[PDB]
Design a protein around this ligand. Structure first.
Ligand SMILES: COC(=O)[C@H](C)[C@@H]1N=C(c2ccc(Cl)cc2)c2ccc(OC)cc2-n2c(C)nnc21
Ligand SMILES: C[C@H](O)COC[C@H](C)O
Ligand SMILES: [Cl-]
Length: 111
């Protein structure tokens, strides 16, 4: 049984995965497939891949012991995107928008 704070985190996660945000969330649904995408330098540049399916698995498996650990993974996901891609690329604009959704709701965390 998740703590109250981790319940809030799980709610955020469900929201990020919902159809409401799909237009900009979809690149983050699954691990980057570097070979499929032709980005053969991705794993040289990104040492700690992260994506929402992995966050979801970790939540289901009770891997996260607190909200801070959850938030660090979601933010790592966005950071990888900002690290690999030029700041004016489409996928970066999507990341910024999804991160806005995440940060404003994470800020509503019950004490
Ligand atoms: C050539 O650069 C790319 O393809 C990067 C690696 C890729 N761009 C994208 C990307 C490029 C253009 C648009 Cl409009 C949306 C996403 C990408 C696409 C699919 C995907 O999972 C299936 C992950 C993507 N992703 C993420 C997350 N962070 N960077 C990307
Ligand atoms: C767009 C920045 O990379 C992240 O900003 C988060 C803010 C809550 O929109
Ligand atoms: Cl953090």
């Amino acid at each position: 049984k998740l703590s109250e704070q981790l319940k809030h985190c799980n709610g955020i996660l469900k929201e990020l995965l919902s159809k409401k945000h799909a237009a900009y969330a979809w690149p983050f649904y699954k691990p980057v497939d570097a070979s499929a995408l032709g980005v053969h330098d991705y794993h040289d540049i990104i040492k700690h891949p992260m994506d929402l399916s992995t966050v979801k698995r970790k939540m289901e498996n009770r891997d996260y012991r607190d909200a801070q650990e959850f938030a660090a993974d979601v933010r790592l996901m966005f950071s990888n995107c900002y690290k690999y891609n030029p700041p004016d690329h489409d996928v970066v604009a999507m990341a910024r928008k999804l991160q806005d959704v995440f940060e404003f709701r994470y800020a509503k965390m019950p004490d």
